[PDB]
Swiss-Prot record:
Main location, first listed in the record: secreted
Location relative to the cell: Secreted
Full protein name: Beta-agarase D
EC number(s) from the headed UniProt entry: 3.2.1.81
Keyword Cell membrane: no
A GO CC term assigned to this protein in UniProt: extracellular region
Enzyme class: hydrolase
Lineage of the organism: Bacteria, Pseudomonadati, Bacteroidota, Flavobacteriia, Flavobacteriales
Catalysed reactions, semicolon-separated: Hydrolysis of (1->4)-beta-D-galactosidic linkages in agarose, giving the tetramer as the predominant product
Active site per database record: E154 (nucleophile), E159 (proton donor)
Keywords: Glycosidase, Hydrolase, Secreted, Signal
Organism: Zobellia galactanivorans (strain DSM 12802 / CCUG 47099 / CIP 106680 / NCIMB 13871 / Dsij)
Domain of life: Bacteria
Function: Cleaves the beta-1,4-linkages between beta-D-galactose and alpha-L-3,6-anhydro-galactose residues in agarose. Cleaves agarose in a random manner with retention of the anomeric-bond configuration, producing beta-anomers that give rise progressively to alpha-anomers when mutarotation takes place. Requires at least 4 consecutive agarose units and is highly intolerant to modifications.
Length: 357
């Protein structure tokens, strides 16, 4: 028996097919794992389902990247207890961290210590991954995501800065969940693409903040070229090759596709409108796909692979103080950090299925 037994799988396995639970990957977090400074595997009974660090390199060696912005990932900021995975953030008085700011020069902010874990079982399309999670009531990022070992391909389940802040400085972002993915060129020619259309910042009328709410959120990774997103059992977004459909604030579907880019090669940039990727309106997903000539996966050919996902991925859950938030002082302040509950991400369960006939 599992915590999710009574919860319908919202993704469609397809005609003639059903969903098969991926037992080793899935975890309903009902055991005890006490936090430790050591890098260790953890799980129920004898099982090793996770380790308390950012994901290893393809060769198995540690990846010692400590996080974006002024984040420092810390082994002992991860525990399992009370039926939940707990991943939290804290600060040490006087501790600071430098990172490259928006002017391509170093800047410093208070260092945010935070947990980060990686699942020992990788996933690849076709696969559905869903978690039940209490989003942190914090301006920090509550993250559940997938990343290839070589750091080139990424599919996010949740990236949410759910708390408006005690002074509401993060109110604009707190009402949204970023439904996202990334593709990268690795150094030396480092480039990063993620969805920047207005509709990728998903919300719902009557929800002012996600912080403190417990939601179910998942991604159905259908194929190299298709992702579907789900919140509380409802499909809310599809990315399909070169077109997008997303549920608007009132629940109604809008079909869109990219209006323009400067190039579809590696030095290309988005044409923007109102601060977001400029998108045109279509009348169905097929109409949008017909009209579009620009990938919504890899518009600038960073992967040089037919603009598609192609690599198995590690499941990562973490908290982050990202550079853009930290530079803008949207990161937590001392008063907010006095409330532990607000700074602790709780995952009740994460389940993984693949479609089988
Ligand atoms: Ca649980």
């Amino acid at each position: 028996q599992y915590d999710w037994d009574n919860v319908p799988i919202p993704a469609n396995a397809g005609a003639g097919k059903t969903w098969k639970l991926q037992t080793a990957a899935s975890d309903d977090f009902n055991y005890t794992f006490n936090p430790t400074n050591n890098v260790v595997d953890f799980g129920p009974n004898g099982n090793m389902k996770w380790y308390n660090k950012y994901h290893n390199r393809p060769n198995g060696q540690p990846n010692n990247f400590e996080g974006p912005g002024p984040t420092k990932w810390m082994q002992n900021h991860v525990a399992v207890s009370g039926g939940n995975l707990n991943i939290w953030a804290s600060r040490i008085p006087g501790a600071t961290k430098s990172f490259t700011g928006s002017n391509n020069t170093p800047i410093s902010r208070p260092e945010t210590r935070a947990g980060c874990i990686t699942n020992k079982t990788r996933v690849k399309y076709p696969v559905f991954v869903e978690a039940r999670v209490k989003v942190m009531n914090s301006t920090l990022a509550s993250d559940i995501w997938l990343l290839s070992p070589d750091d080139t391909q990424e599919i996010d389940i949740m990236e949410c800065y759910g708390g408006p802040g005690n002074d509401n400085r993060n109110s604009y972002f707190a009402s949204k969940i970023h439904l996202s993915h990334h593709v990268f060129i690795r150094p030396p020619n480092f480039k990063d693409y993620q969805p920047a259309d207005l509709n990728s910042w998903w919300g719902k009328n009557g929800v002012t903040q996600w912080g403190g709410k417990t939601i179910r959120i998942g991604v159905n990774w259908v194929s190299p070229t298709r992702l579907e997103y789900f919140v509380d059992g409802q499909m809310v977004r599809i990315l399909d090759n070169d077109a997008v459909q997303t549920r608007l604030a009132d629940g109604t579907w809008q079909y869109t596709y990219p209006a323009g880019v400067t190039s579809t090669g590696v030095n290309g940039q988005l044409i923007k409108e109102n601060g977001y990727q400029k998108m045109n309106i279509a009348s169905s997903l097929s109409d949008a796909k017909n009209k579009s000539n620009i990938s919504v996966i890899d518009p600038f050919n960073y992967l040089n692979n037919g603009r598609k996902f192609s690599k198995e991925m590690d499941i990562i859950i973490n908290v982050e103080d990202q550079s853009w938030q930290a530079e803008a002082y949207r990161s937590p302040n001392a008063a907010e950090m006095a409330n532990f509950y607000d700074n602790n991400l709780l995952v009740d369960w994460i389940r993984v299925y693949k479609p089988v006939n």
